């Protein structure tokens, strides 16, 4: 079997029957940090105790770092082939909370920033929410791609707090002044662990967090309940008050559709395949959108170009053919789990590099993978 795991943000998608195709073992959700280690170092111990198994792929919503890429290129690539890093689906980052009230909770970006910096410690500081009492932040204890996607937004947009947020996979390391300004912030492990803490009725109401939209509510409809999942984007544009949007996929799809393709000449560099958002467009960075739901990003796949086993090679190719297909694809399942399919031009680009047999980057390319590949 082909073994993968990593990011919890999309784990329920990858666990849905037939999203992963023949040969793929059930996906093991353990966090993006562990997913990257598992793949880069071939350490199945990050997935489970049966370390006779080899790792074949990972899900991650944390980008591979310069050091990770360079180390793999030097240590593993000569014998195993190039790694491949590609977007899987696009996603919002939802803000679920436990605080009763008939009023819609609609955070301005400034309010969001204050909640997560500690500047706003009481629900009464959220205009229009009709709520009062302490806010308690729940965050991911471990190295998390959800944290990376969220802190990338805070870094770009929270520009008038006392401190600043660094982009990181460890939330406790993000704010320059630390977590100390927050009173009783709670760390939990996994998307599921954070939601369990958020939903814990043995403690007082008031908790809030950042979350995969597939976990942030029991069903898609729940993402539109602003008494449980915050709208984000409240403000004033051209002199007129505007409401924020829910993190429903429909509210980020327009922004995703116009994300530029990875620069053609550099498509041999895995770093260019994962777009990141930022304050302004330029140098490969895509500006966070001024319309729709504001907090978005990509979750990604990490594979090898080459596998020692020919059956596994074909099975990986069959998965790419489905996941990036023009038709007979995973898009209905992607949408059903609160995510945004990749645009057609993105699917085509992924296929043209990693599937089309003649391409030097293609999975199982006979000239490149001659005598090479990750162990079965």
Residue numbers in the entry: 1 to 376
What sentences appear in the manuscript?
DING is a family of proteins with molecular mass of approximately 40 kDa, with a conserved N-terminal sequence of DINGGG. DING proteins are one of three families within a superfamily of bacterial phosphate-binding proteins. In both structures, a phosphate ion was captured in a binding cleft between two domains.
To enable further study of DING proteins, an E. coli expression system for HPBP was constructed. Then, the insoluble rHPBP was unfolded with 6 M guanidinium hydrochloride and 1 mM β-mercapto­ethanol. The chemically unfolded rHPBP was refolded by the dilution method. The refolded rHPBP was further purified by chromatography, and the final yield was 43 mg per litre of culture. To evaluate whether rHPBP was refolded correctly, the purified rHPBP was crystallized and its structure was determined. The structure of rHPBP was determined at a resolution of 1.03 Å. The revealed structure was well superposed on the native HPBP with r.m.s.d. of 0.04 Å for 327 Cα atoms. Furthermore, two disulfide bonds were formed correctly. Based on these observations, it was concluded that rHPBP was correctly refolded to the native structure.
